């Protein structure tokens, strides 16, 4: 787009390139940050940039931002078990915040790979049906098998009218 | 129009197509109620063959009879289409030639 300070962050590619996936126990991320002082430049840049990337890959996690109540910027992760994860961000940078969050509460590369390997199993290559869920519609189009009657007409010996005609006489 | 205003108003959607004199039907079956002559607009002068019919929907509207020469009288069943005549204001219907009582144009013999 054109409107906005950074039009790039409002694109599907930017939202998809941010790889931060929370665990199933993660429910709430409450970020508290200030709008003044040189200490909180990293927290402000984190709120400006990385919140959309985290939100895109965690749609069910509620993220709430708060401004100018606590003098120290921090994050509070509310889990399913009730444990509150307190993350102090005073001089951390924008990339350091993301790396710290992924370290403390996130999903490993192998964990993501096993989920996607399970997901690709649902679509099965040998199944038949519509093009949305299956690769083949009718089994005629397979090379070695009988062609589709709407493309190559079948011989008179395989048509049902000739079989009825021969039985009639 | 700031981003907040665009989000508040939503994306623009194209309005639905307004129905024409035929109320969305390609053709309408009618009975001729008065055959007469109407004049064109200012830039060009003629004497067009116009008719007044009763459409199957119960609406009474004016139509135009294309072609040179016709034999249409009272209580005659014809079919009209959404042909708009540019020279005649308010006439948005044209009688289909080659119908029950409005047949094809005859050649001068």
């Amino acid at each position: 787009p054109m409107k906005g300070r950074f039009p790039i962050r409002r694109t599907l590619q930017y939202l998809g390139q941010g790889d931060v996936v929370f665990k199933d126990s993660v429910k709430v991320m409450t970020v508290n940050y200030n709008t003044h002082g040189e200490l909180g430049e990293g927290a402000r840049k984190f709120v400006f940039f990385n919140i959309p990337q985290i939100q895109y890959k965690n749609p069910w996690v509620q993220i709430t931002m708060f401004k100018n109540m606590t003098p120290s910027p921090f994050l509070r992760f509310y889990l399913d078990s009730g444990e509150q994860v307190l993350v102090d961000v005073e001089s951390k940078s924008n990339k350091e915040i993301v790396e710290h969050i992924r370290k403390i509460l996130g999903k490993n590369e192998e964990t993501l790979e096993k989920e996607e390997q399970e997901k690709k199993q649902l679509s099965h290559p040998a199944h038949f049906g519509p093009r949305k869920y299956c690769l083949r519609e009718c089994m005629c189009e397979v090379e070695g098998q009988v062609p589709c009657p709407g493309l190559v007409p079948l011989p008179k010996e395989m048509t049902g009218k000739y079989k009825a005609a021969l039985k009639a006489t | 129009a700031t981003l907040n205003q665009m989000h508040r108003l939503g994306p623009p959607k194209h309005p639905p197509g307004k129905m024409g004199p035929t109320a969305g039907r390609p053709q309408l079956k009618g009975v001729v109620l008065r055959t007469f002559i109407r004049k064109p607009k200012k830039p060009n002068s003629a004497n067009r063959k116009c008719c007044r019919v009763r459409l199957s929907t119960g609406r009474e509207a004016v139509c135009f009879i294309p072609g040179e020469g016709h034999s249409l009288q009272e209580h005659h069943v014809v079919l009209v289409q959404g042909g708009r005549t540019q020279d005649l204001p308010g006439v948005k219907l044209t009688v289909v030639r080659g119908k029950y009582d409005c047949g094809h144009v005859q050649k001068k013999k």
Binding site: P1, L12, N68 | -
Partner: protein, 112 residues
Amino acid sequence: SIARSSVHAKWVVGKVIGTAMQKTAKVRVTRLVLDPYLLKYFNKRKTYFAHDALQQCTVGDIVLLKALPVPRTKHVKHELAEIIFKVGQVIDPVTGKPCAGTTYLESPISPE
């Protein structure tokens, strides 16, 4: 351990709107929703009813809510779990000291 709720909001955070109801708090949770056209995240508000047995929530509190295993009524399905930030009286979780906005009421560099 048969204690489950049918609502998706297992745990939510919101601001207290009104406390006119007796032992019942009216909270507003703000979530981030993506606009399919602008591709931008906007704050969508939703009102929730919560049970405050002790009646301590005032107007302006940041409140955590846990999904109630059984709904007491057809509109109350949550309970007040903890108050995160009391209005006007904020305690910094990282330092444990009272703060007034961006200013420290009690400096942590003076233990005694």
